[PDB]
């Protein structure tokens, strides 16, 4: 279960997708925070997840509501996700920072 | 241990029934956040978790007490329930959005 | 490791005692959140538990401080603890309300 | 696997805490829980302390919270576990502060 | 998995660099707590962290944003990163405190 450090940016339409490598080995993506960069306006932000759902189907989850002056960063304890998921801001024009761990399986 | 994304939205008169099928493998429950939608009043909003407890006897639970402009988000680390569970608002409009994971085993 | 979902509300009068019975297995309660009840004050909640400590004695313990327009709810991330347990407002007039896990051997 | 007893202590200005081991085999563990406000503590900051041996081999202090009772009364460490020997302490605040965790032993 | 406690402070002008230095074992840093020492100003405070990513190229990622005002202390309930790690504030001047495990196998 070695792991490495993972990260992205959100905007309003800055998506980011998770992707399955052409490896052999199992990935997951275990969330730990999401923040609000210095640039964001106090607004409502909104941060949302789609993957794969028990039978089969796309599922959009929300992560996590933040707000500049009453909760700046949601701490998730470690989310695990399989591969493929967006993360996406549904709403608020961010940016919004992700951070997490990547883990892998040789 | 195999693991795909959950999620819910609860409203004032919209719960949401976990259920699991006539599978063979086990099945739980693994709630992350419970955090405020971008429309929701600024009134309290408490949500409830109604499962077996050990007695045999269902009892219902309150799993956070959330409020727009103090805390619009709250982090559960990874809450697991055993399969039934309903989860409803007691109080407040929502909408009320719950994501996590659904973990099965064999 | 079974587990059940375990809950209780707390008020001024109103201790908790967790409990067990002629059992043969290893019990725990999993502590996960303290909230504010909708009928709760906008006065200081403290939440306290009682078990034993490792030198055998009873042991009072402080799980959260909560307020209503401050911290309604406190997030305890599966705080494990032997029974007997009791669980009281150490002040504040409630109601209170705990949820975790009901763990068995 | 191993087993666990509740822990609890209070912190003042004047008043830390050391954590005891004894003349035993059990390799002991502290896992720390939560840290709050008591109900007379007044409303300035507060910052918990934690003390213990770092990897290479000397003291380190460290800073577990900061809290305030009107900002964030309560903060919650998930199971911070730390080896003994340790001591917790108030850098600064008057308090009380409350600690909560597990004491955890096994062998 | 042999546990040491970790900490660090970090100001606009003073970051903090992990690196065991090369034994034959692994060693971890898992983060705890990002809080803000008595000092600070009441401006935001952005801390982030740099390592390698699964393509072994570095990535930086923001691990924490801090108020004074408004939240003072972030959890981060065990976040593990293996070394080297840089540790830096990103905006604001501290200080800023980190806690956490120095874990080796
Ligand atoms: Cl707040």
């Given at each position: 279960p070695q792991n490495y450090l993972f990260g992205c940016e959100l905007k309003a339409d800055k998506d980011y997708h998770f992707k399955?490598?052409?490896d052999e080995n199992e990935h997951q993506l275990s969330?730990?925070?999401v923040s609000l960069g210095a640039g964001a306006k106090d607004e409502l932000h909104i941060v949302?997840?789609?993957?794969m759902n028990y039978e089969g189907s796309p599922i959009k989850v929300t992560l996590a509501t933040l707000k500049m002056s009453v909760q700046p960063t949601v701490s998730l304890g470690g989310f695990?996700?399989?591969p493929p998921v967006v993360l996406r801001l549904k709403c608020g024009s961010g940016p919004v920072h992700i951070s997490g761990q990547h883990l892998v399986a040789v």
């Open positions: 399955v490598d052409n969330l730990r925070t949302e997840a789609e993957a695990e996700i399989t």
